[PDB]
Design a protein around this ligand. Structure first.
Ligand SMILES: Cc1cc2nc3c(=O)[nH]c(=O)nc-3n(C[C@H](O)[C@H](O)[C@H](O)COP(=O)(O)OP(=O)(O)OC[C@H]3O[C@@H](n4cnc5c(N)ncnc54)[C@H](O)[C@@H]3O)c2cc1C
Ligand SMILES: NC(=O)c1ccc[n+]([C@@H]2O[C@H](COP(=O)([O-])OP(=O)(O)OC[C@H]3O[C@@H](n4cnc5c(N)ncnc54)[C@H](O)[C@@H]3O)[C@@H](O)[C@H]2O)c1
Length: 355
């Protein structure tokens, strides 16, 4: 029972219809890129990837629409004709057109996005805001990352980053939109690094290539969840951002979220003020900061991840509940953390480690 496609036209429009044959399909399931004379749509079908890749017979405008009929898993993509005129055929298929391939065997597709804004979050961490081109449809699911790609003398260089929400606070958060064109990143700049000093030199209005998403976090791990624990070190906070927003808005069974956020100094606590205000205005969230190397006087917890620390933080409740623990940070932090979580009697299906 394999997916397929068709197309039709009106005086001014060209519609491509993709028949996935799947329940569960939504706007995170398809990525569309197109130019004036070519068109590419990749659709997530279970563990496989269905590609339409066509050079269009006549030119189209940049703005287009995407619509999902979830009952039957039908996706319709409506392009706008430049000139209102009848097409003889859709176009010439291009590389890998109408192919169905396991995602494990697929490669990274990129398009160019524009740097819109950059704001300092800590002394070495910025919030970057990139805008997708009008001719792209791309949503990044919770828990997944994309690759950014930049040119340097003789080659291009690539690193992965985890998109975040623009804010944790409702007064600044983007509303739920039919199509976010803006992607946010929290990125730490390493003076001795290869990629991030170059990213930090990019001017407002220049362009960065962005891949399609990657990562296996299944958001179904949040069905009926009641107690969420987040373990983050440094920039390992970034996958927690969207998870935290989701925990507080789309899990009506959620009793508690608790974040334990490990950093070196007070100056390194990304979004400290936002986290503190969020926790105060919402008793479901608890936030604790652990500093491994404080500068100033610190009447708070100190150290690195330990067996003592998670014994108290994950102390067993009196009542049984559906539980999830997410951990992200430096490899040592995550390796030591998951070892400790198995020693505390948490199952594999109760732990996700981003790595
Ligand atoms: C799935 C995924 C998601 C990520 N998401 C984000 C994100 O949202 N935000 C973010 O800021 N970063 C994220 N990272 C880290 C990020 O991808 C880059 O590794 C980071 O930006 C550094 O790249 P760089 O070229 O600037 O520095 P690099 O040149 O790679 O190194 C910078 C410095 O770090 C130290 N260092 C480098 N490699 C090692 C090593 N193997 N062992 C010990 N020390 C080392 C060295 O001092 C080096 O000078 C993510 C990584 C992964 C794998
Ligand atoms: N999806 C992902 O896999 C993903 C996403 C985001 C960030 N990351 C990774 O998270 C890491 C964050 O690096 P950073 O510069 O922000 O951290 P950092 O250097 O600021 O250190 C932050 C905290 O990490 C902990 N830590 C550091 N070294 C440790 C060790 N040897 N043992 C135990 N704990 C230790 C300490 O408590 C420290 O306070 C990066 O390596 C990045 O690649 C991964």
């Amino acid at each position: 029972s394999y997916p397929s496609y068709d197309w039709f036209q009106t005086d001014s429009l060209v519609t491509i219809a993709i028949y996935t044959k799947q329940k569960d399909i939504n706007l995170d399931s398809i990525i569309v890129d197109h130019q004036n004379d070519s068109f590419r749509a990749e659709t997530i079908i279970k563990d496989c990837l269905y590609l339409i890749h066509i050079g269009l017979s006549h030119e189209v405008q940049e703005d287009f629409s995407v619509r999902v009929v979830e009952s039957v898993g039908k996706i319709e993509i409506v392009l706008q004709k430049k000139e209102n005129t009848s097409w003889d055929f859709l176009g010439h298929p291009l590389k890998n057109h109408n192919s169905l391939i396991p995602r494990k065997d697929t490669g990274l597709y990129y398009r160019k996005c524009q740097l819109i804004s950059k704001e300092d979050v800590t002394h070495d961490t910025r919030l970057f805001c990139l805008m997708l081109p009008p001719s792209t449809h791309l949503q990044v699911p919770i828990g997944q990352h994309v690759y950014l790609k930049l040119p340097i003398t003789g080659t291009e260089i690539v690193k992965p980053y985890t998109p975040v929400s623009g804010s944790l606070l409702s007064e600044f958060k983007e509303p739920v939109l039919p199509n976010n064109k803006y992607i946010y990143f929290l990125i730490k700049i390493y003076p001795t690094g290869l990629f991030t000093p170059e990213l930090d030199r990019l001017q407002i209005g220049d362009f960065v290539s962005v891949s399609s998403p990657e990562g296996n976090f299944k958001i179904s791990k949040f069905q009926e969840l009641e107690d969420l624990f987040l373990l983050a070190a440094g920039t390992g906070f970034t996958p927690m951002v969207k998870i935290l927003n989701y925990a507080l808005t789309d899990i009506p069974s959620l009793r508690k979220v608790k974040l334990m956020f490990f950093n070196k100094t007070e100056d390194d606590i990304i979004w400290r003020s936002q986290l503190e205000k969020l926790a105060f205005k919402d008793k479901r969230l608890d936030v604790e900061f652990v500093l491994s190397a404080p500068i100033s006087e610190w009447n708070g917890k100190q150290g690195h991840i330990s067996p003592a620390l998670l014994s108290e933080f994950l102390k067993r409740n009196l009542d049984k509940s559906k539980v999830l623990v997410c951990i992200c940070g430096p490899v040592p932090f995550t390796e030591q953390g998951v070892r400790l979580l198995h020693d505390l009697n948490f199952s594999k299906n109760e732990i996700h480690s981003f790595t």
